[PDB]
Amino acid sequence: EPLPPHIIRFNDMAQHLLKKVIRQADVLIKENPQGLEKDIALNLVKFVKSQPEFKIGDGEWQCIIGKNFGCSLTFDANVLAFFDLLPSRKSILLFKSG
Amino acid sequence: MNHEPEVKATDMEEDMIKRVKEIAINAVKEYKQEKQIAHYIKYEFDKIDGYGWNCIVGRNFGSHIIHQTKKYIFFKINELCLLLWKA
Amino acid sequence: KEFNNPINFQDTETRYGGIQNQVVNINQYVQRNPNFIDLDNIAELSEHSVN
Amino acid sequence: QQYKTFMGARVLWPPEAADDILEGAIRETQDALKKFEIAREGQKIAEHLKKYMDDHFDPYWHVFFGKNFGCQAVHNKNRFIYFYIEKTAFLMYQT
Amino acid sequence: RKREASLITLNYIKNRFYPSKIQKIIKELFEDRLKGVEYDPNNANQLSERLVLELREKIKRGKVPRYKIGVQVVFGEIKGQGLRIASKCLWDVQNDNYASYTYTSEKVYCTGIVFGCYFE
Amino acid sequence: TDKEYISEEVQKAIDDSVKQVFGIKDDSSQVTITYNKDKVNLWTQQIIDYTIRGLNKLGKHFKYCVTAILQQTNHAGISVQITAYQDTNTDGSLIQCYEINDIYAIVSVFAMAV
Amino acid sequence: HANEQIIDMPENSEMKSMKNDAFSQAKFAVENYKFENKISSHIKKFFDEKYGPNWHCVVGKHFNAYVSYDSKNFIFFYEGQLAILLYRKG
Amino acid sequence: LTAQELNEDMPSKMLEPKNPQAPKNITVYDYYTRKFKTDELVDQMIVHFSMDGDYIWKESNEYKTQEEIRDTKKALIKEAMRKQESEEPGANHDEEAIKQTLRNKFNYNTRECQTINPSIRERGVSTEPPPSDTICGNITQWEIFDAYY
C-alpha cells in the first residue's frame, strides 16, 4: 500500500478513511493536470459518496479545492479531512455539514 | 475606497441579499485576516438564519457544495471571492 | 578581565512533571453533533525593504 | 541596516529567513558563482538558483541580485534572504 | 572589518545555527524511540523519561558546546482533548534561539521543546 | 548573597501569576471558569506574560524560559519531564503542576546564569 | 532610451488602464522621490490600491532577476536611465 | 526588562521578553483600507503544539446550542415521518429513509463555483547599463588657439 506525498493541516477523521481519500485525490489531479478546481472537486465528492461504508451520516459530502482560501465551517464529529498534496501544491477540504 | 460587491451566483430573497452585502462590508474592515473575516460572517449569520451555516473567503479556489434552497449566496468583492451557504 | 569559558559546564539534573488521576465519568459529554473549525491555507505575510 | 559576516558572506544580521534555509541558500550561490560568473552570463545563474529553491524548499521563490538596486517586497514569515558577497547583493523571498 | 572584529569583543556569540539543525536532530531521534505509536500505558511514562535523558546528550553532539541546553519533553494521550502548549523565554535577542518539533500519531502526541542560552 | 537562585522565590512567582489570572484562593471554589477553545489561546498569553513580569520584579541577572502546558479536563495520561545541561552550583530549574477546577495546567521555569 | 522593453500585460478587455498606469506612475514616481527603494514603495502601493494586492516591483540601475508571475500582469520598462520591473504573484 | 553590564567596560547589552524567531512585523492586506497594512507590534509568543478538540461539559453554554440543533433536526424528521405516516395508509417507512426522503432536488440544490485564477509563469530579465568608454584628451594654449584661428 503506497500513499502519495501530502501535508496534513487538520485531520478530524479516522486514518482508514483519510488514506482512501488522498490516494483518489492524487490519481484524480494526475488525470486532469492544469485542470479547473471544480472539475476535480466534483469527481472527488462522487467517489467518496459512491464508495460504501464511507458514510458517517448527518450532512452531505461537499469538497472545496483551492491554492489560496481561508474559511470557517460547522461539520459533523470526526468527518472533516484537510490535506495539501506536495507535488500539485493545492489544498483539499472535504467534510459533511448538518 | 471599497465599492459595493457584485453577486455572481446567488439564491437569496430581495430582503436577505441586502443583509449579506451589509455584513460583508462590516466584516472586511473589522478583520484583516482571511480566516477572521469568514469567522465573523458565520457567527452573525447564526443569529439571523438558525444554528447551521458555513462561510469561505478565497482569493483563488473552486468547489461544489450542497446548500439548502434560498440559503446560498456567492459575492465577489474587488479581487476577493466570498462563498457562504447553509447545511 | 573580559569573558572566557575555562570553567567546566557539564552537570545535568532532571525533574518529573505530572497530574493527579481523577474519576472516569468526569461529568462531560464527548464531542458536539456539529463542530466549528476555521481553516486558513494562506501563510502570514510581512514586508521588508532592502536597498 | 546592520550587516554581519557568516559563511564567507555579508548578510543582514537579524536573519529574516530561518537559519537552515539561509545557510543552504548562501552556500548554493557561492558554489553556483564558483562555476558561472555574474559579469558574463548573469541571467543563467539566477534561473539556476530559482529552480534550486523550489526543489529543496516551498515553491514560488523570487530571486533578485544586482550591483545596485532598491526593492520593497511582501514575503511570507521567515522567507526573506538578503546578503552581499564581495560587491554583489543577492535578494530572494518566497510567496 | 574593524566593527566586525569589535562585534566579536562585546559578545563572542558563537551563533551555531540553532533552529532547524536541532529541529532535524530531535525529529530523527523521536521517530525511532516512539517505536509503537499505539503504546501509551502507565508503565511507558518511566520509559518516556529515558527518552528525555538520551535527547539532551544528542543536543550536545549536534554542534552546540558553548551554549547552555535546557530541554522539556511532553508525552500525552489524545481523545479529541483540546490543549495548547505555548512558551516564551527571556534571553538576548539574536544571541540565543529555541528549537521545537511535535510528532502526532493516530492515538498519541509527543512534543519536544529545546532551549539553548549562550554563556561565557 | 544579593544575587543567587532560590526554589521558594520562583514557586511564589508562579503562584501569584496563576492567582492573578483566576485564583482568589482562600480555600473555597469562589470562581469556576471551564476551559473554552477561545479562552485557552488568551489565557496562555496572559499567564506567561504575568509569570515573566512576576519573575522580572524580584529578578537578578538570570535569563528565564517559561513554558505553559494546559490540559482539557484531564482523563488523558500526560507525563512532562525536564532536564537542564547546566552547572549545579550555578542554576536550578523547577516545574509546578496546578489543579484548577475543570482546567489543568503545568508551568515550567528554566534558570540560566548571565 | 528604453530601446528594448518586455510588455506581458492583458491589453484586451479594457485592462490598458492597468498597463498605461505602469508608464504613467513610473515617470511621476522617479523624478519626485529620487531613491530606488522609495520608488518600489510608491509604484507597488498604487497598483495594489487599484488592481488588488500581491504585486512585487523591484527598481535598480543595474540588476539581474529571474521570477515567477501571474500570466498577463508582468511589465518591464526603462523610465529614463532607471530600469523598473513590476508583476503580480498570488 | 533588565540590562546586563559586561565585565571590563564591554559594550552593554540586555535581555528582552520578545522571542527572536517570531517575525519582526506581520502585514495583512485590508480590502476596506484597499492598501497593505503593516503591524510593527507582534504577539511574540511561541507555541510548540496547539490542539483544539471537540470536548464539552454537562450544562455548558455550547451544549445548550448543540441540544437545540438536535431538537430542530429531530422535530423536522418527526413531522416528516408523522406526515408521511398520516398521508399513507399504515406506512412502513424507516426513520433513515425518511431523512433521505426529506432532502429533495427542490429543497437542497447543489451549485459548483470556482474563481478565475491566472496561470503562473517564470521569466528572466537581465538589465546591463550602457557601456562606459575611457577617453584621453590633452589641451594646450596653442591647440585651443589653432582651432580658434
Author numbering:
A (entry chain L): 14 to 111
B (entry chain M): 1 to 87
C (entry chain E): 12 to 62
D (entry chain J): 16 to 110
E (entry chain O): 13 to 132
F (entry chain N): 4 to 117
G (entry chain K): 4 to 93
H (entry chain D): 61 to 209
Could you give the paper's own sentences about this structure?
Thousands of outer-arm dyneins (OADs) are arrayed in the axoneme to drive a rhythmic ciliary beat. Each OAD is divided into two regions, a head that contains AAA+ rings (rings) for ATP hydrolysis and a tail that holds together the whole complex. The tail is permanently attached to the MTD A-tubule, while the head region of each HC contains a microtubule-binding domain (MTBD), which binds and releases the MTD B-tubule depending on the nucleotide states. We reconstituted the purified OADs onto MTDs to mimic native arrays and determined the structures, by cryo-EM, of free OAD and OAD arrays bound to MTDs (OAD-MTD) in two different microtubule-binding states.
Cryo-EM classification reveals that the OAD arrays adopt two distinct microtubule-binding states, MTBS-1 and MTBS-2. In both states, the relative axial positions for α- and γ-MTBD are fixed on MTD (γ-MTBD is always 8 nm ahead), while the β-MTBD position is equivalent to either α-MTBD in MTBS-1 or γ-MTBD in MTBS-2. The OAD unit together with the four binding protofilaments (OAD-PF) was locally refined to resolutions of ~2.8–3.8 Å for most structured regions in MTBS-1 and to resolutions of ~3.8–6 Å in MTBS-2. The arrayed OADs adopt a fully parallel conformation in which the three AAA+ rings are stacked together via linker–ring (LR) interactions. In MTBS-1, β-HC adopts a post-1 linker docking mode, which is precisely switched to post-2 along with β-MTBD stepping forward. On the other hand, α-linker fits well into a groove (groove-1) formed by AAA3S, AAA5E and β-CT-cap in MTBS-1, while β-linker matches another groove (groove-2) between γ-AAA2S and γ-AAA3S. In brief, γ-Ig-PT contacts β-AAA4L PS-I with the help of γ-kelch in MTBS-1, while the contact site is switched to the H2-β3 loop of β-AAA3L in MTBS-2. The TTH interfaces involve IC3, NDD and α/β-HB1–3 of the OAD0 tail region, and α/β-linkers, AAA2 small subunit of β-HC (β-AAA2S), β-AAA6S and the C-terminal cap of β-HC (β-CT-cap) of the OAD+1 head region. In post-1, OADs are attached to B-tubules and form ordered arrays. The TTH interactions between OAD0 and OAD+1 sterically restrain the nucleotide-induced allosteric response of OAD+1 and its downstream neighbors.
